[PDB]
Design a protein around this ligand. Structure first.
Ligand SMILES: [Ca+2]
Lengths: 67, 66
DNA sequence: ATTGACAGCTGTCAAT
DNA sequence: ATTGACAGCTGTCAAT
């Protein structure tokens, strides 16, 4: 199988941090992310569905707010 | 988004409804059954899945009144 | 324990 | 009053 390219995942991670208080990209943002990361839309969607569960709280805890 | 025009053919839905009724105690077609139904209904797989997600909420309960 | 993925559900919008 | 669709979530599976 394999994992997603590290630069692709770097971009998604940076976006999630910057928008961590509304971690839901619009259709156009998802489209920009797809093109930037060279991933499909479905891949970008799936990453966000996983990352809102697996990365985001640890981010918002480090911040004071409680998910 | 999700801004269609029209409803699914009556014959396509009669097939889905018949299958749902016959399998009403395990209303989950296998991948092999989803493929057969799609060929029969002339719907895509995704259309079939969506019908079943809706039908299990909208049709199945009233059916299980037996 | 991490990661990518997806079947099926909830909730809702848009269309009859 | 019904329908087709779909975003995002839950739960989970296979691969790391
Ligand atoms: Ca889905």
């Amino acid at each position: 199988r394999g994992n997603l390219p590290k630069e692709s995942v770097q971009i998604l991670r940076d976006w999630l941090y910057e928008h961590r208080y509304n971690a839901y990209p619009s259709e156009q943002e998802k489209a920009l992310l797809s093109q930037q990361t060279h991933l499909s839309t479905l891949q970008v969607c799936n990453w966000f569905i996983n990352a809102r569960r697996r990365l985001l709280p640890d981010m918002l805890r480090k911040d004071g707010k409680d998910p």
